[PDB]
UniProtKB/Swiss-Prot annotation:
It is an enzyme of class 3 (hydrolase). Residues 12-323 form the GH26 domain. PROSITE patterns: GH26. The keyword Signal applies. This is Mannan endo-1,4-beta-mannosidase. One of its GO terms (molecular function) is mannan endo-1,4-beta-mannosidase activity. It comes from Bacillus subtilis (strain 168). It catalyses: Random hydrolysis of (1->4)-beta-D-mannosidic linkages in mannans, galactomannans and glucomannans. Keywords: Carbohydrate metabolism, Glycosidase, Hydrolase, Polysaccharide degradation, Secreted, Signal. Gene3D superfamilies: Glycosidases (3.20.20.80). It is found in: Secreted. GO terms for cellular component: extracellular region. InterPro entries: GH26_dom, Glyco_hydro_26, Glycoside_hydrolase_SF, MANB/E. The record marks 166 as: Plays an important role in maintaining the position of the catalytic nucleophile.
Length: 336
């Protein structure tokens, strides 16, 4: 069975990587890509996180993340919150045997700038969806700058795990729910519209053919599947999971049931307690979440490098690290 990107015009390299990723759970080893968040572009992004993991374990994460959007900033123009200077490092990461991932802590276009965690009403959200309003124009200004950055990677044929509008079932980001675990049918509909608006802007308006689209609800809130925009807009489903108990993460059954590859799209300790153990997380994957194709641990205090079990995580027979995607000029096996 071949798994093809949802974008019908995806570049060959992106098609190959998507099919390869989807088949990882058929392997007996090297079946879960490691990953780490590298930081926010021109703010905290650097190679330090990758280098610390390598110093701690001898291995580097297969996936390296950057976030273009510093959505807390109050800026003259809303799009000033976007910075794409991490691109060079992302392209180099691909060249050197890993895969880049981009997320977006978008500023809130209901406001002049910033306000990324300020909740908005459905009436405000409707304005954001309408390209003719000041709110819609602010959204499109951000999307345009993001797309300019993404184009740089496309020009070198670099596939990107693109994970927009994450944790939408949470109540913290402007694009999500407004109250804790409170179903709002209109908000769910509007979210799907917003995700599709970004999909169409990137794919059709901007012709971006190197993107693999990731849908990532939070594990610690309800409604993991209600926000799913549909099979034609999503390549990979996953959970952002911050926890103490690796074995009690909710949502894996619901998301794998959508018949898309599944990942732990963010992971880390819920609290800095000295109790968190990444060796237990990989064990939980083997026992509880075997269809997992990758994890992306956050940086700073959430980092694999500074938490217990880093070596066991990175050396587990299941873990696939930087340099293990390609075997020189050949691709490592696609198992059916």
């Amino acid at each position: 069975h071949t798994v093809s990107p949802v974008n019908p015009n995806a570049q060959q390299t992106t098609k190959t990587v998507m099919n390869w990723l989807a088949h990882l759970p058929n392997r007996t080893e090297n079946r879960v890509l490691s990953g780490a968040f590298g930081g926010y572009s021109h703010d905290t992004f650097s190679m330090a996180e990758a280098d610390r993991i390598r110093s701690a374990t001898g291995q580097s994460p297969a996936i390296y993340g950057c976030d273009y959007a510093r959505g807390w900033l109050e800026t003259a123009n809303i799009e000033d919150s976007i910075d794409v200077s991490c691109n060079g490092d992302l392209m180099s990461y691909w060249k050197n045997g890993g895969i880049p991932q981009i997320s977006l802590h978008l500023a809130n276009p209901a406001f002049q700038s910033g306000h990324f965690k300020t909740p908005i009403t459905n009436d405000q959200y409707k304005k954001i969806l309408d390209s003719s309003t000041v709110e819609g124009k602010r959204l499109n200004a951000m999307l345009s700058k993001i797309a300019d950055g993404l184009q740089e990677l496309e020009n070198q044929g670099v596939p990107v795990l693109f994970r927009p509008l994450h944790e939408m079932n949470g109540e913290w980001f402007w694009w999500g729910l407004t109250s804790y675990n409170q179903k709002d049918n209109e908000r769910i509909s509007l979210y799907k519209q917003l995700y599709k608006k970004i999909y169409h802007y990137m794919t059709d308006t901007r012709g971006l053919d190197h993107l693999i689209w990731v849908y990532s609800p939070d594990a610690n809130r309800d409604f993991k599947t209600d926000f799913y925009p549909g099979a034609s807009y999503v390549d990979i489903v996953g959970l952002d999971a911050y926890f103490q108990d690796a074995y009690s993460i909710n949502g894996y059954d619901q998301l794998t049931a959508l018949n898309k590859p599944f990942a732990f799209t963010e992971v880390g300790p819920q609290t800095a307690n000295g109790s968190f153990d990444y060796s237990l997380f990989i064990n939980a994957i083997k026992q509880k979440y075997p269809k997992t194709i990758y994890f992306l641990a956050w940086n700073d205090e959430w980092s694999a490098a500074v938490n217990k079990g880093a070596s066991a995580l990175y050396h587990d027979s299941w873990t696939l690290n930087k340099g293990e995607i390609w075997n020189g000029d050949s691709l490592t096996p696609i198992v059916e």
